[PDB]
Amino acid sequence: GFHMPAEWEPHSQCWIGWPERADNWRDGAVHAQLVFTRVAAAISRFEKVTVCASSAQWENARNQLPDHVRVVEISSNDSWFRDIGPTFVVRREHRIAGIDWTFNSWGGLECDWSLDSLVKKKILDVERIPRFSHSMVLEGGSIHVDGEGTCITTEECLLNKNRNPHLSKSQIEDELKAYLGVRKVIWLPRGLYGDDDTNGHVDNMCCFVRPGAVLLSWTDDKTDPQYERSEEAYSLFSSVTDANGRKFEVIKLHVPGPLYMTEKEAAGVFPRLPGTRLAASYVNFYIANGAIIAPQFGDKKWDDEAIRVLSKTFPHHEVVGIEGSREIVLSGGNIHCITQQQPAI
Amino acid sequence: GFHMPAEWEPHSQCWIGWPERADNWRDGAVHAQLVFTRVAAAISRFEKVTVCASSAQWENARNQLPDHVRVVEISSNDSWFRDIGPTFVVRREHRIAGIDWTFNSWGGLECDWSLDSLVKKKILDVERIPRFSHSMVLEGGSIHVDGEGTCITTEECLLNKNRNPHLSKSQIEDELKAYLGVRKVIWLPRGLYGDDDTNGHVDNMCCFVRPGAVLLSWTDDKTDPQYERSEEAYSLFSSVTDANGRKFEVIKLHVPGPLYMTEKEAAGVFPRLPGTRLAASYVNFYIANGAIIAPQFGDKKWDDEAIRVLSKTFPHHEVVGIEGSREIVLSGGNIHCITQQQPAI
Ligand code: NA
Ligand code: NA
Ligand code: NA
Ligand code: NA
């Protein structure tokens, strides 16, 4: 009787990690920490925030973050709490639980994720919230829900042999149905071009706005490899209905750039290579209570256009652009990847 | 308008650390961890418990402790949360706060306590409880209160030049009055003989049973050096009144032994020396909601007598003796030293 509510439904708080590993974040994560502070501070205007830092980083996080953000000590390999935090479910006796999916470092065998694996159970232990363990590998960034019985995902990620090669698509779909409380799963073939680290997480490709409506990463440039992925997703959405028999409205959200890691950015990481195409999309935003917390990549034309489209799309939410989001995407993710909502009960 | 309530007043939870340092706990703390589990499990029958472990120990603590005990990650140098946890105060607007006294490793300059110093603020941050910082050095084990305006302490500890040599007795007393919400401080000259590590903490010498009544560490052996300390305290209690003008009832609680570290015990620590007299007293018990959690040192005569006296003294509480408490005292403390109550509001 539990289900995953939509991200726009009310939250009691948001969980965020704290970056530090010098081999993934340039210059010892100094720039990324400034942006994590900016994101946490912005979200905290709208809902309570907990930032989780290692022992070595706790004082730094506590100094940078404002007093009304809670700072706890939770050790991790890295700081992508969308994927390593628990996925909370509600039953409207316990009324909230967390799903502890198995983590495997985004298909990483094919190199240590043991601390990251413990993040789900540690957060649930802090909150004294029951844990539902699952042997299936899954990351929260790979699924999206409308809270009304529909889930969207990508085949590129969930059917990759680096995830659950013991399972067929039907078996995976049945676990999503049972654990997320959904009745229909929409399988986009592919996520964002260039998102090789996650194998095409849906949260970088498409998300719900409301039941029956999605934002879709888009480019008007038919010569760019993103075009065929976005067009294929657009065609799928235009050909199917949701779990309640609604047609989809699709709103295009144009990708920046393309953006590429510079020599200076790559040199700061102790592998991240000069010229690497960045997996950048404005779709990787977080919905906080009454707010959209949206990336800004330092590409003025597309940054301003994304704020315009998000403001029109979410007319009852305050849209907040976060300067410096390029510093998150240099390490492979964005605002949605670093957050995990806790639904209110 | 805040004051420290008595330890027998209702608690919302109890905070406990988790031992691990091989240079203070024999055999890598394996024996002490069994006893910390025993104490936490016993307290948890009566009130909620949080055990705080380092990243390296979190899984071990989580395995040993029962499911209804919360396990959080808080780093520390060592695990004496009576002295390194916050002292909570209540105002019956915020109704609870924590005092963050300065810690200095029990006068330790005259050798690293930087992580221990952060424990107070970390616990208050987890709970989102306001923090009152104090520049004065103080450990919670060095004071005891009745919740009705009286505090007892020792001169041996608080007037030692290794604590607050900038302050006179009057200045220290005024800080206790202001921060604990007390109107009279009773200064025992001395704590327990042999308690050189803490310089005679009151919690190993004497504690309140109820307003107007104390338990006092005692020996009938006039040849033992404890006798003159206990007799001096008995005479003081018999000569003064409390903050409300009550005379004191004194109940004697006979020390075990004396007990001495064995060669085998000392050899297990990676300094703790063979033959060291142990600073052992049954006074170092914890009052949980409706329970007395009391040491048992493996000295059958005095262990049984302590349970008899505590059961008579606290007729409305369940007395629970903890087997293996000698393993705590080998490292310089006991059940009261490893706990810190959080008062209910
Ligand atoms: Na701060
Ligand atoms: Na991958
Ligand atoms: Na356990
Ligand atoms: Na000392």
Here the tokens at position A304 are 């301003």
Cα gap B265→B283, rounded to integer Å: 23
Q: Which residues of A32-58 are buried (b: 16+ CB within 10 A; e: fewer)?
A: bbebbbbbbbbbbbbbbbbbbbbbebb
Q: Which of A155, A219, A235 is closest to A191 using CA atoms?
A: A155
Q: With contacts defined as CB-CB under 8 Å, which chain A residues touch B71?
A: 125
Alpha-helical (H) ranges within chain A are 30-43, 58-64, 81-84, 114-117, 119-127, 155-158, 169-180, 226-237, 263-267, 300-313, 326-329
**What is the secondary structure of A30-47 as a DSSP string?**
HHHHHHHHHHHHHHTTTS
Please list the residues that pair with A335 across neighbouring strands: none
Does A73 contact B122 at a Cβ distance shorter than 8 Å?
Answer: yes
State the smallest CA–CA distance between residue B74 and chain A in angstroms. Answer: 6
Structural domains of chain A, count: 1
- Is A112 flagged in the annotation as binding? no
Three-state DSSP state, A222: coil
Terminal-to-terminal C-alpha distance of chain A: 14
Q: Which residue type sits at B278?
A: L
The verdict on whether residue B197 carries a ligand-binding annotation is yes
Whether A125 sits inside 8 A of B54 (CB atoms) is no
| Domain range enclosing B92 | 1-345
Buried b (16+ CB within 10 A) or exposed e, A323-332: ebbbbbbbbb
Residue B252's CB is within 10 A of a number of other CB atoms, namely 14
Rg (CA), chain B: 19
Pairing of strands A96-102, A131-137: parallel
In three state form, how does the secondary structure of chain B look? CCECCCCCCCEEEEEECCCCCCCCCHHHHHHHHHHHHHHHHHHCCCCEEEEEECCCCHHHHHHHCCCCCEEEECCCCCCCHHHHCCEEEECCCCCEEEEEEECCCCCCCCCCCHHHHCHHHHHHHHHCCCEEEEEEECCHHHEEECCCCEEEEEHHHHCCCCCCCCCCHHHHHHHHHHHHCCCEEEEECCCCCCCCCCCCCHHHCEEEEECCEEEEEECCCCCCCHHHHHHHHHHHHCCCECCCCCECEEEEEECCCCCECCHHHHHCCCCCCCCCECCCCCCCCEEECCEEEEECCCCHHHHHHHHHHHHHHCCCCEEEEECCCHHHHCCCCCCHHHEEEEECC
Query: Which tokens belong to A272?
Result: 């991240």
Contacts of A315 (CB under 8 A, 6+ apart): none
Catalytically active residues of A, by annotation? 337
Amino acid found at B289: N
Count of alpha carbons within 13 Å of A13, Cβ hemisphere only?
13
HEC sequence for A143-169:
EEECCCCEEEEEHHHHCCCCCCCCCCH
Q: Which residues pair with B15 in a beta bridge?
A: B50, B340
CB crowding A203-238: b at 16 or more within 10 Å, else e: bbbbbbbebbbbbbbbbeeeeeebeebbeebbebbe
Give dist(CA B195, CA B204) in Å, integer: 8
Comparing C-alpha atoms, which of B239, B163, B255 is closest to residue B201? B163
In 3-state terms, what secondary structure has residue A26?
Answer: helix
Interface test with chain A among B13, B50, B58, by most A beta carbons within 10 Å: B58
Query: Tell me, what CATH number does B141's domain have?
Result: 3.75.10.10
Cis peptide before A66 (omega within 30 of 0): no
Rounded to whole angstroms, the Cα distance separating B208 from B229 reads: 18
Q: How far apart are CA B38 and CA A344, in angstroms?
A: 35
Strand pairing of A70-73 and A48-53?
A: parallel
- Sign of the C-alpha dihedral computed for residues B121, B123, B126 and B131 taken in this order: negative
Contact between B149 and B182 under an 8 Å Cβ cutoff? The reply is: yes
